[PDB]
């Protein structure tokens, strides 16, 4: 037990080359069906290979913020899948490194990643997406801006920033629900139904952040603390899942 | 009995890479619905249909990608565990797991053909009837200037055959060293295909170039790349 | 300090690969657990350390009941484990393979964490492989790091599963010397190798286990002159 | 036959893990290649069968030059190979592990393909594991399928790399009997195990190889009474 040791540099560098490969596979593929649609109906002379394709290239920082929870969940299981398969994760647990500390070594390398997703999701993503509407319409909001929408607008009166103020807390409970089904014996369950099980049980928690989110019109709970209940109710049962 | 084993390890990892890739790209099309329900001033009766009918425009790009990203996941799994070095050292050559990566490429090119001419147009006669030009079935009767179709409806089937062939020799990277990170030259080549071939029809279609001459010299140069890279043992 | 396992059992497809096994080991003596490729001297090692859940067993560290503790909780009470299935970290070095388990044991400072890894690579003769890789190692050289990594945790009650699986004729009599120098410092291991000439000349007792059952137990000068042992183990005329 | 390897060499980081090795093996005699965890008795086995490309070598099947043929082309000329790194198919059965290499050898019909797999599982005593799985096997039981799968190809010139790596005391003297019954039928193997009491009592010659070099060669009753062999191999005071 040391802050940022050697095993934390080993799990933190194994999955990091799998986060950045699932992100490249998802950002590029969403950059095709935005390329196909923005070129299918061209109409005018400004809409061709360039100018209507430059609109896609100026829209990839918007496609990082929406695809990082689904790529950092997906790559953390493909990265821990190659460790438990080659039996080099049982020898960590058989030497004092508890499975909560395997979970902590993912938070030391994915929570500084969503803070990079947050830092480009409010400074360069609304700037570049609005700039993309000017090289496409030349002759043919934010997060800090929502602090200006706190009262001066005249389920929604506050509950749009506070489900994005803690995305680092909401991304992290998706990880700990994922890497609780990875551990097990190596003989019978052949590592196929341990990743697909982990993606599915970590996907049910991703739909229950915008379905349980707009549900303040039942009693009148504060929306700032009422939007924290889905994460914290599974963060408790996750820390039991990898304790037994 | 070893082609049956090479099939059921890719076909068990092609399904689990198709559904996971569909749920990611439809949750995104489910959260734009919340951006088009309250502030768009329209009710919610059509999203239940529009989810299930928003599929075949999406499941015609990832249906080729659910093949060759399913082959890299299960050939690289068979190389690090040294399962193919015993396949070579008992007989059979590298032209068996080409033959095995072309049996189930037929199984995907059948489904990707039903998707492109029996459910492609069926979606747009149910997307344009509830929640509102080139979506017929057979085009060997007319002679319209939009010859993008029958050269883009067809080469979403040769894309299944060719991308399965170009990823057999891109998996052998794992004797005893090196990285497993071999998904990058296969994915960076699949971007270059769909930045040219599906987009040679709106700047080089509609009366600019001929989309039969140029929509196959991109497709056959990109097929001879999948043969000269596979036949790398008697070069010179 | 006596690790004790009483009446373990395990069945996979209704086969009952382990039957009423009961092995006890003190601290300061090393004990063999031998038998053919039947018995399950690894499934017994799984149920003691805790990878697979047992069915009828009872594991006691001398007064306790750790039979429902997970894998990592027993590793801090003293149980060490060396697996059979070739488990190195494969992309750290050999110096980082030893150092990654020395970032535990919160009694070593930055001084004695550095001269323990530089001393463990002297008694195993792997100092010329100081930073090669994990992947680019070789058979017995891979096995000599997995033993050196397992002795680096400073446990009690080590369960060495196949230590001499294809090492050397020289590096076994060099491992056997430093598995006895740790025996004198109060540490009792459970060797279960298959060449029964290096494992029986170092153990003090033995548990010859056939298909699910104990069939013999006693001194190493006794195990050879039992005739039911020579029928299902030991070959013949040994 | 005579497989011959002449003046092989291999260097990874400028280390030269193999030096001027030269081993020849006839058909009908079995030959040892022993040494510590130095020499590279697997890197020599890699350069003969052809997984890694050699640097200065020359491999001859008795009159030919197969030194630039790929891995699969040498396996049809007669070279068989048993790897060290635990290579079963892991999701086929044990009956399908033996049958998957019997779908080659286009001289067996559907009759003698079926009574060869049912006979190979008798001389190895793995008939009670007829359909378990590959994954749910166990150590030496995994090793007894990889040997039985390698003898099922009917090759010449087998290069058995660690056959007895943690098997049994009984199943080794049962494997040694059926590696001599194939020796009498014109098939010469290259055993390279580490317990030098089962491998030296079955071989006819030996090549004790240290860090990159041959240091001894001769009869098995000679290899023990060489003193430079007992310094870097054999332990000490060995019988
Ligand atoms: C990159 C994108 C993510 C890649 C995900 C990789 C997932 C691969 C896991 C393969 C899962 C195999 O699961 C099989 O799912 C099948 C679906 O039919 C089950 O049947 C089988 O029992 C079960 O073995
Ligand atoms: N998950 C499993 N499913 C079915 N059978 C299994 C499983 N795990 C082990 N077995 C069987 O249980 C028996 C004993 O396994 P195991 O505990 O590994 O014995 P073993 O001692 O390790 N063999 P060896 O290591 O050579 O002494 C063998 O017949 C295996 O086939
Ligand atoms: N790819 C590689 N890169 C660097 N060093 C390597 C590589 N492959 C092997 N080596 C080294 O080469 C030496 C011999 O390797 P190897 O041929 O496997 O010997 P070996 O005979 O297999 N050891 P053993 O099987 O126990 O007898 C060892 O020191 C290895 O570390």
Author numbering:
A (entry chain G): 1 to 140, 249 to 262, 269 to 358
B (entry chain F): 2 to 133, 249 to 352
C (entry chain A): 2 to 239
D (entry chain B): 2 to 240
From the paper:
The cytoplasmic LptB dimer binds and hydrolyses ATP and the transmembrane (TM) domains of LptF and LptG create a cavity to accommodate LPS.
To obtain a nucleotide-bound structure, we incubated the purified protein sfLptB2FGC with the non-hydrolysable ATP analogue AMP-PNP. Unlike the sfLptB2FGC LPS-bound structure, LptC is moved away from the lateral gate TM1G/TM5F so that the TM helix became invisible in the complex structure despite of the high resolution of 3.5 Å showing near atomic details in the cavity of the transporter. In our structures, the sfLptB2FG and sfLptB2FGC process an open cavity to accommodate LPS, while the sfLptB2FGC AMP-PNP-bound structure adopts a closed central cavity with a closed dimeric conformation of LptB. The sfLptB2FGC AMP-PNP-bound structure shows a closed dimeric conformation of LptB with clear densities for two bound AMP-PNP molecules in the ATP-binding sites at the interface of the NBDs (LptB dimer). In addition to the residues of LptB2, we also found that two arginine residues LptF_R292 and LptG_R301 on the cytoplasmic loop 2 of LptF and LptG extended ~9.8 and ~9.1 Å, respectively, toward the NBDs to interact with the bound AMP-PNP molecules. No densities of LPS in this closed cavity was observed, suggesting a post-exporting state of LPS. Two lateral gates TM1F/TM5G and TM1G/TM5F shift into a closed conformation with their respective TM1 and TM5 helices oriented parallel to each other in close proximity, a ‘cis’ conformation. In this structure, a detergent molecule (DDM) is trapped at the lateral gate TM1F/TM5G, with hydrophobic tails trapped in the cavity while its hydrophilic head extends into the periplasm.
